[PDB]
Amino acid sequence: MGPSLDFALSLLRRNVRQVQTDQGHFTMLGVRDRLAVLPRHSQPGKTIWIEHKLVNILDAVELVDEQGVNLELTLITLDTNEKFRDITKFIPENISTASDATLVINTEHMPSMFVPVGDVVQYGFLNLSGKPTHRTMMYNFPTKAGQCGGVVTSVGKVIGIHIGGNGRQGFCAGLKRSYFA
């Protein structure tokens, strides 16, 4: 088996978890220690279902930029038994585009799912369901409901978390390594 599939499957085993909140099913990316990231609109509460058990959330931080605008990312600290493998090194230091990226999803309804979103380009401002968001990127793929929190990945880099789509295109919140310092 080659390196790109090995990388994604290893993400699916060690960092990319099936979750459910009151808002439905999402993919959650565990980044290091007991710190994970979800799309803000998943609205995690005091507990979250993670695969096979209910896990307590010890803190949730909704990220905004210096203008006060939503980044659509919520960092949660979990009462998990074990620490995540630290994947912060795979997150670029600036928000970064990619060629021929794949969106890797993992929910109870869409387990171990691979979506060929393709080139990922800078987008910036997005108004989704009424809320302004900054720092997004875009792919010309018709993503659908249930795929939020999916991990946008390319050549060993974890670059984005899926947050929205308009039927023809998909959008992620860009990831940068400093969100997880």
Ligand SMILES: *[C@@H](O)[C@H](C[C@@H]1CCNC1=O)NC(=O)[C@H](Cc1ccccc1)NC(=O)/C=C/c1ccc(N(C)C)cc1
């Ligand atoms: C994941 O939960 C989901 C994935 C979307 C659903 C449709 N395709 C996808 O890829 N995301 C959403 O439903 C988001 C949620 C959101 C809320 C607030 C801030 C950021 C994200 N919303 C959307 O993707 C918007 C969908 C939409 C609304 C209205 C229209 N009409 C045509 C104006 C089109 C699309």
